[PDB]
Design an enzyme around this catalytic site. Structure first.
Site, PDB file in Angstrom:
ATOM      1  N   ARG A  96      85.576  43.258  16.224  1.00 42.63           N
ATOM      2  CA  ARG A  96      84.872  44.153  16.893  1.00 42.63           C
ATOM      3  C   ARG A  96      83.569  44.616  16.278  1.00 42.63           C
ATOM      4  O   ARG A  96      82.433  44.780  17.036  1.00 42.63           O
ATOM      5  CB  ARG A  96      85.597  45.578  17.024  1.00 42.63           C
ATOM      6  CG  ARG A  96      86.977  45.500  17.692  1.00 42.63           C
ATOM      7  CD  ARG A  96      87.075  44.831  19.040  1.00 42.63           C
ATOM      8  NE  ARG A  96      88.351  44.761  19.850  1.00 42.63           N
ATOM      9  CZ  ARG A  96      88.933  43.738  19.490  1.00 42.63           C
ATOM     10  NH1 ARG A  96      89.038  42.909  18.639  1.00 42.63           N
ATOM     11  NH2 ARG A  96      90.136  43.550  20.311  1.00 42.63           N
ATOM     12  N   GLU A  99      81.461  41.778  17.611  1.00 45.81           N
ATOM     13  CA  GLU A  99      81.106  41.995  19.143  1.00 45.81           C
ATOM     14  C   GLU A  99      80.099  43.066  19.034  1.00 45.81           C
ATOM     15  O   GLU A  99      79.125  42.836  20.084  1.00 45.81           O
ATOM     16  CB  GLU A  99      82.335  42.557  19.852  1.00 45.81           C
ATOM     17  CG  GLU A  99      81.742  42.667  21.298  1.00 45.81           C
ATOM     18  CD  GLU A  99      83.340  42.681  21.927  1.00 45.81           C
ATOM     19  OE1 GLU A  99      83.999  41.696  22.239  1.00 45.81           O
ATOM     20  OE2 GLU A  99      83.721  43.979  22.483  1.00 45.81           O
ATOM     21  N   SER A 122      67.124  46.890   5.727  1.00 46.80           N
ATOM     22  CA  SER A 122      67.628  46.130   4.353  1.00 46.80           C
ATOM     23  C   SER A 122      69.124  46.071   4.683  1.00 46.80           C
ATOM     24  O   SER A 122      69.790  47.337   4.902  1.00 46.80           O
ATOM     25  CB  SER A 122      67.350  46.793   3.026  1.00 46.80           C
ATOM     26  OG  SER A 122      67.719  45.901   2.198  1.00 46.80           O
TER      27      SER A 122
HETATM   28  O1  OXL Z   1      90.803  47.390  23.055  1.00 44.49           O
HETATM   29  C1  OXL Z   1      90.032  46.550  22.557  1.00 44.49           C
HETATM   30  O2  OXL Z   1      90.638  45.682  22.812  1.00 44.49           O
HETATM   31  C2  OXL Z   1      88.802  47.122  22.324  1.00 44.49           C
HETATM   32  O3  OXL Z   1      88.559  48.675  22.611  1.00 44.49           O
HETATM   33  O4  OXL Z   1      87.582  46.992  21.821  1.00 44.49           O
HETATM   34  O1  OXL Z   2      67.553  42.733   3.053  1.00 45.16           O
HETATM   35  C1  OXL Z   2      66.635  42.590   2.393  1.00 45.16           C
HETATM   36  O2  OXL Z   2      66.311  43.876   1.705  1.00 45.16           O
HETATM   37  C2  OXL Z   2      65.163  41.482   2.204  1.00 45.16           C
HETATM   38  O3  OXL Z   2      65.033  40.412   2.388  1.00 45.16           O
HETATM   39  O4  OXL Z   2      64.094  42.083   1.399  1.00 45.16           O
END
Ligand code: OXL
Ligand code: OXL
Ligand code: OXL
Ligand code: OXL
Ligand code: OXL
Lengths: 156, 156, 156, 156, 156, 156, 156, 156, 156, 156
Positions: A96, A99, A122
């Site tokens: 999830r 997603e 970051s």
């Molecule tokens: O129920 C699910 O499968 C969801 O809520 O993301």
């Molecule tokens: O996630 C990071 O901070 C980066 O490249 O500077």
């Protein structure tokens, strides 16, 4: 002197052993992190191979879990990070969060550039926490806070 | 009658046309969403192909961006969601959210099961928002709140 | 108002038009960047879809390449970055930099944690440059300097 | 007689043993390479399975790390190179170098062709080094130098 | 001034147009290269998008194939090389050369290291040619000669 | 009775054991093949899991490398061929042969059809060899000859 | 002079135009191949981009399908073969032939080595045919005959 | 009571042990299948993990190969089928059957729909056999007969 | 004479056109399938490129949506099936059905083998339907019924 | 205290040992679940690594299968779910359910949106069952009922 890993399987095998010990002792992540002075998210991530523990915290959790000295030492090594087995999670709980990036990833980009400018939020100067909140319509909700520094992209 | 899409490129092409119009007009996402009664993350996601707008909001944002009637109708269609071109983002701003999953994904699984139980935090009964907060050490932070209903996995 | 892209193909199509115009006019990247106040690596990356030009630079390079007003506006949008067609380059010139990571990537990790500590060398607070040097044994060498800030990973 | 490997996991398992021994002795890679005559980047890469050490160097690092004779012999074998587990790094520290290629790979191709011509910058007649420098703005920077021979592509 | 491409599709599209013209004119690759001063394998590779022709050659072949001025200019651009659509060839003729690497790739590594040392046989300081030779047992054989410079990997 | 394998890992694990024994004995592939009546490329490929040795050759090499009876028997089994770990080599020495295919694959197709006809150059009725010669400009070159029967594709 | 393709999409687009013409005429593949002197599997494969037709066959099927001169010429070009969109078929009818390989592929290897020896059954000196027969239990069966030459792998 | 597997590696590991016993005993698949009352193709696929043997046949082959009781029970379990290591075969003998599908897969679809109708040729109501036939031009050919029931796709 | 396709994009392009017409007319799938004598799941799947409509059903839906003649004809052609863009759905609604497989696929295998035997539940002799019902605890549920013939796998 | 896993291989290895024991005792999934109070699909899924058993059920099935204490504890852990080895099933029985999604996935999305609205049918608030039904035309059918809560996607 700081020490680092280059193969994630050493620490992920250690994580399995830690989880077996934790289950036989019937311990929680909250109780394992208690006394360390460190957030449960950070200490749990270290047990699961994704952060390094300072030495005092490694010794404390090591005592709690009855770990051996090589395992206490391994917990202090900087890990080869990457917890997903093969890029996209199969487990529904982990999926999830993937997603959420398939649905909102371009909106997060667009709103970060509008609010802050070119650059990134970051993942390194970064904290997260998980909180449980009652849902007013019934049941429970998780509020997970991602809190990262803005680093700008500028011309040179 | 509700209408839905099955090829994401229709809505993603519309998003690219929307962004060109928006840039020609020098508009913000916050001003596009103003007046709709809907949150900027929701409206922005719809413009970007990942949500559907109700008809009144589609006409409101269509007037701001000077969209034609076919485009305003397309914004009301339920989309074929998935904003990442090929599973893992290449863009640095989007990638850091994927990296948060690579570092913390198993921690979020573990702490969700500890705090709530077996099951998931929903990505459907779900909202997110992005806030800018001053960093006390200097600079700016984003606080991204992911707020999802816990749905339990129970035996039957 | 800052404007951003979410689909790399718009700017990569623009890059192909820019390169055709550049070739028909028999121009160099050095001459295109002349007068902008910006380094060749930065302006070339923007032409190729991987950086945004400030408005005055966009207008300067647009007049040199005879670009239309939509193209000049698109160069000012923050891009959806990622120049490699499908994750691993096929082109030999590009592939050698990927091979440098296959041979030295773990050594870069190990030496960065030894010299600085846990954390990263940023790709955001970062610049690179390419210089030609004579080889004493005959021929020429490229000295390509990657220069990024260290950002630490600390417990919380 | 030179000897070569064909399965990277032999030398990668040796690397993991080497790292555990190194950590138990609280050793640095700078100290391991001290006295070998060879640069820390080269020696460290050999430890990590990506280079071969000459016999004297293999015996000297073997004494420092308490390696057995089969391990000393393995460090002199020419490796099956490729340090990244599955093409794209998951580890944040290593990933930033891949991101540098996603943002600048086409710009490196274009400026290599402009400054030198068709062909490549070699990854074989090639050295790299990592230098920690002071950030004049505060903090620390890594300057990673990629120094490769230009090899032309010419008609025949 | 040298000019280089970043999207292989432009030159691959041109190759399809060249092949249609070639077929309408019932021309061979041998006769298209004859008179250029350049080897058939080099000129054929350039037509197919994998090498750049010098201007005079591009004009010669352009007149033979009735190409327009934009196409003759595109043949002179340094290509974004990589002829395989998606990493492994599907075509049986091309696939057999990939199978030769699946059967003999480790043997080529091992014998290269034994005869030459650590390092590579170059694909850049490199030529190949294809000859037809009668088979004594009946039929015909191809003798394809790969001729590359050895570049050593040495300690530094 | 001929015997064949279906899992490459059995013969690849035997190859690792062979290479350790070879290195301990400080042997060359040339001397291992001496006395078998078979070409170094063919015998080496068998050691490395990609061909089968006739019983007398397997007994001869087995005595030289001090192999046990199951190993000698395994060398005579027909292998499950395919030496590349995951489709595209990571190792630079092997990768250059793959790059030769990315640059000249379609040229090899085109010239094979022009010189021979529709069909293939076989990878089964096939031999290769590797020679080391001086480069007239200094240094050394490999001349690698692929020699395969033409098999025509004809209508039916 | 023989002519060949290097990008499968030219002939696969022609296949789609052929199939639309065939459908408007209510033609069968058996009728299209009638009178050509060639088997319906071979002619159908050429229409679908996977074989080349001789000139008299190309003009004959071209007459039946009302094809233009460039299309008749394209059918005579040696194709860039490979009909599966992305390696594994999604279509159920195609997929069952792939599944036959997942269930029997190692048995086919084993029994070919037992009956014939080391080596292959050719896909080039090869024909196939599809026959419809009654199922004695009720219904109908396809009998698909794969008829390929055995080519041995021998020592050299 | 019927019993089934869910991880292919248990039966594939059994296959490797079976093949080593078979080679030590210098046995053929024809002889192993003799006396079972089942086709050699079916029994061989079972030994290789892709079919289940009835108990009397499992006891008969178990005694010939000197298998233990757990192995004889495992041969009776319904397998988790799929013999190809990673989707596309690397072994040349196996790969030719995959290339047959790359060349003829859409022709098989087309002619199956023409002769039978919408639907499939089953890979379950299905058998295959391998026959050796002399080639009249010299040498030997394999005739591999794929014989599956047609199952229609009908409206509902 | 039955006619079939080999490129899914023709019918998926038609599906997009059908969906745009359906939406402009504000029609439901239930209403489109009304009068056709065929199940909504079957008719909908045909509109979306995954089934063929008999000619009378095609004519009648073609009327409703105002399709042109090449479109009413295309609806009757047998499709190249496969609705998922790239193997794993990104859309949440579709993804949950894939997740049901990731959670229960091996249970479905196990319980089909116990209840029926070795073999499959067909996806060809197969019907599906979707019903909306109340949830006894509040809200609504989908009851999706997969109804497939058992086809046995037996020895031969 | 709830306990959860992060590496599926620990519970998948346990499943293989469970299945061996089940086969040695000649047990059915129906009799293992009988007496637990839990549905056969749920218990079977737990045994196979995809659900957690309550403690009493874990002890009950542990006695029936003669499992040790560590195994009984492991059955109580919340799993890292995902039963498909590598995304797309190879096994025919499992593959047909994947094919149902390739044919009907977009139709499920379209009919879910029509009957319910935007949102999903949950795979969490979800049960399935498998029933055997006589086919009136001869043989047997499986009726597999997927029963999931509708969760809406609404604006916010
Ligand atoms: O129920 C699910 O499968 C969801 O809520 O993301
Ligand atoms: O996630 C990071 O901070 C980066 O490249 O500077
Ligand atoms: O990297 C290289 O040097 C090559 O191919 O020549
Ligand atoms: O490579 C081969 O020889 C073939 O298929 O015939
Ligand atoms: O192969 C098959 O038989 C199927 O789905 O019916």
């Amino acid at each position: 002197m700081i020490q680092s890993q280059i193969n994630r399987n050493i620490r992920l095998d250690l994580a399995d052993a830690i989880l077996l010990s934790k289950a036989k002792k019937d311990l929680s992540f909250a109780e394992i992190a208690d006394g360390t002075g460190l957030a449960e998210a950070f200490v749990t991530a270290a047990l699961l191979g994704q952060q390094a523990l300072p030495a005092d915290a490694a010794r404390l959790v090591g005592a709690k879990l009855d770990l051996d000295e090589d395992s206490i030492l391994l917990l202090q090594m900087i890990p080869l990070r990457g917890c997903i087995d093969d890029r996209i999670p199969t487990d529904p709980t982990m999926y999830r969060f993937y997603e959420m990036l398939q649905v909102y990833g371009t909106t997060l980009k667009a709103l970060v550039h509008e609010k802050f400018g070119d650059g990134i939020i970051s993942a390194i100067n970064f904290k997260l926490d998980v909180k449980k909140v009652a849902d007013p319509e019934g049941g429970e909700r998780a509020v997970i806070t991602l809190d990262g520094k803005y680093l700008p992209t500028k011309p040179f």
